Amino acid sequence: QKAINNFLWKKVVPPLVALGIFLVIWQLLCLNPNFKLPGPIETFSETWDPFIINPFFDNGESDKGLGWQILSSLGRVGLGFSLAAIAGIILGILIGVNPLVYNAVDPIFQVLRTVPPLAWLPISLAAFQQANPSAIFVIFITSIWPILLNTTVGVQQIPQDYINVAKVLRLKGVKYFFKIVFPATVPYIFTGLRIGIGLSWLAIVAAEMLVGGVGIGSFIWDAYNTTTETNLSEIILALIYVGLVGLLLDRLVGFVASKVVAD
Amino acid sequence: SQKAINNFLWKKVVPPLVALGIFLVIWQLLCLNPNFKLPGPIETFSETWDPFIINPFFDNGESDKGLGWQILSSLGRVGLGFSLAAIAGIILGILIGVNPLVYNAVDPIFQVLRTVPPLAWLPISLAAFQQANPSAIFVIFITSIWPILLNTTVGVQQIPQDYINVAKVLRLKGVKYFFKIVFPATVPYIFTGLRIGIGLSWLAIVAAEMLVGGVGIGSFIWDAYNTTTETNLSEIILALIYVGLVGLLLDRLVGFVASKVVADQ
Amino acid sequence: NFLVVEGVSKIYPTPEGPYTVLDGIDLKVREGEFVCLIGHSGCGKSTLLNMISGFNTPSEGVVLLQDKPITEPGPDRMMVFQNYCLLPWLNVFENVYLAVDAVFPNKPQAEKRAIVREHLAMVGLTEAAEKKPSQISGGMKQRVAIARALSIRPQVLILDEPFGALDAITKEELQEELLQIWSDHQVTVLMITHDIDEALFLADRVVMMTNGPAAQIGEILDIPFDRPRNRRRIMEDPKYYDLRNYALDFLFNRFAHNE
Amino acid sequence: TFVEIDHVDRIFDLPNGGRYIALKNIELKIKQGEFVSLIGHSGCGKSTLLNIIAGLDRASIGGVTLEGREIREPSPDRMVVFQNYSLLPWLTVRENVALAVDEVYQGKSKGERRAIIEEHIDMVGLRLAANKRPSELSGGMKQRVAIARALATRPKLLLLDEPFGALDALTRGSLQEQLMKICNEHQITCVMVTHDVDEALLLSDRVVMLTNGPEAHIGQILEVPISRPRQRLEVVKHPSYYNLRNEIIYFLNQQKLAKKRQTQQASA
């Protein structure tokens, strides 16, 4: 009762009208003869039954909807990027506790950090030589440094207040590890882990455009090359399915982060 | 007074060199197992030293242009592109974040286009302009506009509550208020927005020119991968270092510039 | 009368109950005297100054500054805030220049460059005329905030707790930078100070207020000390002993009990 | 003597070659159940001197002799209270105290420890802030919990680095009286650092001052003749109180002039 009439007109009405006019102006745009992109009526009506209404309709070696494909390039972000967080923080903590290692391998784990995720494919795919492992590896390399360079920085930003209250106590060792240092780094793991996913999903939806297979990347770019009637209709649909599934991965960590953050 | 150089010589200069030595040696010692198809450090710096290092900026073919041009050519698109985003992103970001009526409506649908992968716009961009060169610039533009537009509106709305108080007591409202209390307050927020809006631009110009060919690193890494050769495997590694090395300057040059005009604290 | 507050209050409408942060206060301020406000946290004294300065909405009453109601914040009730209210990206001279060239769009730059010098050098700020608010000490950046407030010749110089986060060495020095400065300008000053021995030194009429669900002027204890003050014989005067004891007696025993 | 701080001197070897020296000669005979306060000009060095007792720093010349023995490293029998809020934001109030008790009551019984922390967060006050994150607590409430942690340890000493620095002098006044209630019964031997004279003549049993400059001496070890059951609302009426409060102000004024001479030596 306190939100239907008051809270409603700041979060669901303003966006819909703002999105509604965006669709309307988009509709007006296609009136131009030279505007190649089909209008929203064409792109949302002429591709309605094949994909949106009934996903999960495997009809060939590579013939799927936005289902068994979104959950085929997202399963590589679970099998991958899970070894990049388990083996990205422990190396991120082992390096940093002693400010001597994090002086020699800082300008290595930083130069490699600013390497585009999809440039690791040619050498990664030239070593594994297989489509699936080579794609997972790109995820495992694209998102470690966004975690490693945040966990390590988080540990070294331990306030002197926490150390001082630790030195005065006879606290040192494993006991000192799970109460004063690691819980003070969780806030910095989830601000880098958030960067990880989003920068890894970026790599698996672009690095899959080159190696082929099943999943977006083999759908968002497997029909542009093959020109057909209403070809662009099923590309925009994927571009919408992407960007919201990729939005329910930055909010997911944001949701989990707020539930465990040190506050 | 030369000890100043020596003071940090053994602190943050030597250890990195030692770190490379271990990495190269372990990489070199790794290139002994037959089940390791990549080349060792000596191969990937002896096979590729003659044509790709000695004389960069060298032109001999229609689309090779050596390696010096393919790194300068890519930077050209991030210059001509992403400069419209720099000027056309803050202008739209300021004019939308100052008004809470519009930001409350547009922002929920601008945070979806922010997370769209940089290479998901290529099929539409490539099918819209119907050309190669003015499609790799649009993909940069529409990809580095959200990291700035969606991080300036935060700045224009997170102005310290005390700054505004100084405005009211001084009767400072209007055009004067915008230039004297608002815009300089968001300068730190813009540069932290186009610091992340430049890594995502280089990250997209090196991958948006390998699906459309052309001249630039990305059309050379892919070009020098399909043609299997004894020297083939070396460029994909030598160039991979340049992309990282040049990606650092772009992401650091913003910091240096942003460290000389930003509102210090 | 240079100012009048009479029969004014303020009630906050909340779903958990109408809260009254100020109950029918009533006081008058003479032209050319200090006034200081005391009270525990939540006493509402901070809210009170926000109301006179215009930052709040006077409810069930209205101020009568110079026979007129308070309309909006302006460059005649300039208020020195907490957090030092200093822009960190403008140097001291330009920071002060912000106030002077904000409600004087009639005189040329010639006067602006000279007016600031008189109201900036006289407070011991000439060597740091080009420094930025990043190296200045906390007790030193309050001397530009005061300089900014008095540079526009305000009618009433409202002071939120200026020295609420300073050290004793600098805190003692600052007061000597107010009496002499204020004597020349003879501008009414209303200030909030939690620290007794500071109200008793500066103020000319201390008005302590009570705590609880509401508020009201508990006492109007006045200082009879000589207007010139040295803080060396003020303690030596026995009148200051029972005088201060009365404040502590009527600031912890009754009225406010925070605990 | 319960503590025999003697010939405790500290010299800092500044890398530039200045070799700054802070403490030159310090003598103390802190007895059992005695409250002591260090009052200085904020430049004489009080946190450093307190740190020596705390153990976080080691005296370059000489050393402390607490209970007729040398202190080597920080110990949980000399729990301190830092200036900056030393709370852990990810632990609630009742859990912060449990942090210190576990490192001194290393054993005993967990069931007992729950009662001990509960009783040690009530006398200090609170009793309602328990189970409330130390990120929304009042500025003056985040400090009384820190004092609770130190007293819960049941130490032979309890250092108080100036805690009342971020507190306005109305919550500080409301908090000094709380210490009276705490130390009236329990065996306490604090050595606290402050630069506001009001608490020096209020909580202390024997105020010790310090001369400003690189020659920080013990100044004058003034003694306060007031009955132990102190109360701010009656102690002030003691005729000798205001007499002594002037004395400390008198001494601090001399150092204020001396500080000007120190600046005049190099600046002027």
Residue C201 vs residues B264, C190, D217, D219: alpha-carbon distances, Å: 37, 14, 32, 29
Residue A5 vs residues A1, A8, A11, B104: alpha-carbon distances, Å: 7, 6, 12, 17
B162 with C88: Cβ contact below 8 A: no
D57 touches chain A (CB under 8 A): no
- With left for phi above 0 and alpha for psi between -120 and 50, is residue C7 left, alpha or beta? left
Residue C71 vs residues A133, B79, B251, C68, C160: alpha-carbon distances, Å: 71, 52, 50, 9, 20
C252 with D246: Cβ contact below 8 A: no
Identify the chains in contact with D, defined as 3+ C-beta pairs within 8 A.
A, C
Give the C-alpha separation, A151 to A136, whole Å: 22
Among B258, B154, B147, CA closest to B196? B147
Residues of B (6-65) whose Cβ lies below 8 Å from A? 11-12, 15-16, 18-20, 23, 36-38
Residues from chain B that touch A252, judged by Cβ atoms under 8 A, are: none
Scanning every residue of chain C, which has its alpha carbon at the shortest distance from the alpha carbon of B176?
Answer: C102
The domain tally of chain D equals: 2
B166 with C72: Cβ contact below 8 A: no
Angle separating helix axes A131-142 and A83-94, nearest 10 degrees: 40
| Helix/strand number for chain B, H first, E second | 16, 0
| Longest Cα–Cα distance in chain D | 66
Residues from chain D that touch C163, judged by Cβ atoms under 8 A, are: none
Which one of C73, C83, C99 has the shortest CB-CB distance to B168? C73
For D211-250, b/e burial (b = at least 16 CB within 10 A) is bbbeebeebeebebebeeebebeebbebeebbebbeebee
C134 with B264: Cβ contact below 8 A: yes
The stretches of chain C forming alpha helices (DSSP H) are 45-53, 92-100, 109-121, 138-151, 168-185, 199-202, 239-252
CA angle C11, C12, C17 (to 5 degrees): 100
Residues from chain D that touch A185, judged by Cβ atoms under 8 A, are: none
Those residues with Cβ within 8 angstroms of residue D150's Cβ, 6 or more apart along the chain or in another chain: D79, D80, D81, D100, D158
**D161 and D264 share a domain?**
yes
Q: How many residues does chain A have?
A: 263
Q: What is the resolution of this structure in A?
A: 3.5
Residue D181 vs residues C210, C247, D162, D207, D231: alpha-carbon distances, Å: 25, 23, 19, 20, 9
Scanning every residue of chain A, which has its alpha carbon at the shortest distance from the alpha carbon of D90?
Answer: A262
Which one of B19, B112, B207 has the shortest CB-CB distance to A206? B207
Question: Which residue matches tokens 């997202």?
Answer: A74
Those residues with Cβ within 8 angstroms of residue D120's Cβ, 6 or more apart along the chain or in another chain: D97, D148, D151, D152
Structure token pair of residue D194: 């402050």
Tell me the three state secondary structure of residue C19: strand
Identify the chains in contact with B, defined as 3+ C-beta pairs within 8 A.
A, C
Scanning every residue of chain A, which has its alpha carbon at the shortest distance from the alpha carbon of D97?
Answer: A165
Angle separating helix axes C109-121 and C138-151, nearest 10 degrees: 130
Question: Which residue matches tokens 């992340």?
Answer: B196
Residues from chain B that touch A70, judged by Cβ atoms under 8 A, are: none
Scanning every residue of chain C, which has its alpha carbon at the shortest distance from the alpha carbon of B161?
Answer: C85
Among D218, D197, D256, D200, CA closest to D49? D218
User: Does residue C151 contact residue C113 with C-beta atoms inside 8 Å?
Assistant: no
CA angle D30, D34, D36 (to 5 degrees): 70
B171 with C73: Cβ contact below 8 A: yes
Identify the chains in contact with A, defined as 3+ C-beta pairs within 8 A.
B, D
Q: In what order do the strands lie in the sheet with C156-159?
A: C79-80, C156-159, C188-192, C34-38, C206-208
Query: Following DSSP, what letter does each residue of B86-129 receive, concatenated?
Result: HHHHHHHHHHHHS-HHHHHHHHHHHHHHHHS-GGGSHHHHHHHS
**D140 and D264 share a domain?**
no
* Residue that is last in its domain, among D154, D176, D207: D154
D27 touches chain A (CB under 8 A): no
Task: Give the count of alpha carbons within 13 A of A190, CB side only.
Answer: 19
Q: CATH number of the domain at A65-260, out of 2.120.10.30, 1.10.3720.10, 1.20.1560.10, 3.40.50.720? A: 1.10.3720.10
Residue B163 amino acid letter: Y
A104 with B203: Cβ contact below 8 A: no
Structure token pair of residue A206: 């672009």
> Binding site membership of D for Mg(2+): which residues?
83
Which one of C85, C98, C132 has the shortest CB-CB distance to B162? C85
The CA-to-CA distance between both ends of chain C, in Å, stands at 39
Angle separating helix axes D171-183 and D141-152, nearest 10 degrees: 20
User: Does residue D9 contact residue D48 with C-beta atoms inside 8 Å?
Assistant: no
Give the C-alpha separation, A135 to A203, whole Å: 9
Question: Which residue matches tokens 């509550």?
Answer: B161
- For residue C22, the cross-strand partners are C10
Among B93, B95, B110, B85, CA closest to B194? B85
- For residue C36, the cross-strand partners are C191, C206
User: Does residue C103 contact residue C115 with C-beta atoms inside 8 Å?
Assistant: no
- For residue C35, the cross-strand partners are C190
Question: Which residue matches tokens 């159940």?
Answer: D33
Full residue range of the structural domain in which residue D125 is found = 79-154
Method: cryo-EM
Strand pairing of C62-63 and C3-12? Answer: antiparallel
Q: Which among A66, A202, A241 is the top mutation candidate for probing chain B, defined by the most B β-carbons within 10 Å of its own β-carbon?
A: A202
C167 lies in a domain?
no
* Residue that is last in its domain, among D154, D179, D208: D154
* Residue that is last in its domain, among D154, D174, D201: D154
Structure token pair of residue B10: 């053994």
Give the C-alpha separation, C58 to C22, whole Å: 10
Q: How many residues does chain B have?
A: 265
A129 with B211: Cβ contact below 8 A: no
Which one of D169, D242, D249 has the shortest CB-CB distance to C195? D169
Q: In what order do the strands lie in the sheet with D21-23?
A: D21-23, D6-11, D61-63
Structure token pair of residue C9: 């209050």
- For residue D208, the cross-strand partners are D38, D221
Topology (CATH) of B75-215+243-258 = MetI-like fold (1.10.3720)
Give the C-alpha separation, C252 to D3, whole Å: 36
Full residue range of the structural domain in which residue C8 is found = 1-78+188-237
Please tell me the distance in Å from D131's CA to the nearest CA on chain A: 14
Give the C-alpha separation, C122 to C117, whole Å: 8
D84 with A170: Cβ contact below 8 A: no
D78 with A168: Cβ contact below 8 A: yes
Q: Give the distance from CA D146 to its chain's centroid.
A: 12
> Binding site membership of C for Mg(2+): which residues?
82
Please tell me the distance in Å from B153's CA to the nearest CA on chain C: 20
The domain tally of chain C equals: 1
**D165 and D251 share a domain?**
yes
> Binding site membership of D: which residues?
12, 20, 43-48, 83, 136, 138, 140, 195
**D131 and D221 share a domain?**
no
Scanning every residue of chain C, which has its alpha carbon at the shortest distance from the alpha carbon of B171?
Answer: C74
**D191 and D261 share a domain?**
yes
CA angle B87, B90, B94 (to 5 degrees): 140
Strand pairing of D36-39 and D191-194? Answer: parallel
Please tell me the distance in Å from B95's CA to the nearest CA on chain A: 16
> Binding site membership of C for ADP: which residues?
19, 42-47
| Helix/strand number for chain D, H first, E second | 8, 7
Among A225, A216, A223, CA closest to A243? A216
Give the C-alpha separation, B135 to B204, whole Å: 12
Query: Residue D222's domain is classified under what CATH number?
Result: 3.40.50
Q: How many B-C residue pairs are in contact by the CB < 8 A criterion?
A: 48
| DSSP classification of residue D123 | T
| DSSP classification of residue D125 | S
Give the C-alpha separation, B25 to B20, whole Å: 8
Those residues with Cβ within 8 angstroms of residue D203's Cβ, 6 or more apart along the chain or in another chain: D35, D37, D176, D179, D180, D183, D190, D192, D230
Scanning every residue of chain B, which has its alpha carbon at the shortest distance from the alpha carbon of C152?
Answer: B170
For D62-96, b/e burial (b = at least 16 CB within 10 A) is bbbbbeeeebeebbbbbbbbbbebbbbbbbbbbeb
C111 lies in a domain?
no
Query: Residue C70's domain is classified under what CATH number?
Result: 3.40.50.300
Q: Give the distance from CA C216 to its chain's centroid.
A: 19
> Binding site membership of D for ATP: which residues?
12, 43-48, 83, 136, 138, 140, 195
- For residue C5, the cross-strand partners are C27, C63
**D210 and D234 share a domain?**
yes
Scanning every residue of chain D, which has its alpha carbon at the shortest distance from the alpha carbon of C162?
Answer: D168
Please tell me the distance in Å from B180's CA to the nearest CA on chain A: 30
Which one of C73, C89, C102 has the shortest CB-CB distance to B263? C89
Give the C-alpha separation, D183 to D190, whole Å: 10
Give the C-alpha separation, B117 to A118, whole Å: 12
**D150 and D162 share a domain?**
no
User: Does residue D81 contact residue D150 with C-beta atoms inside 8 Å?
Assistant: yes
Residues from chain D that touch A170, judged by Cβ atoms under 8 A, are: 75-76, 103
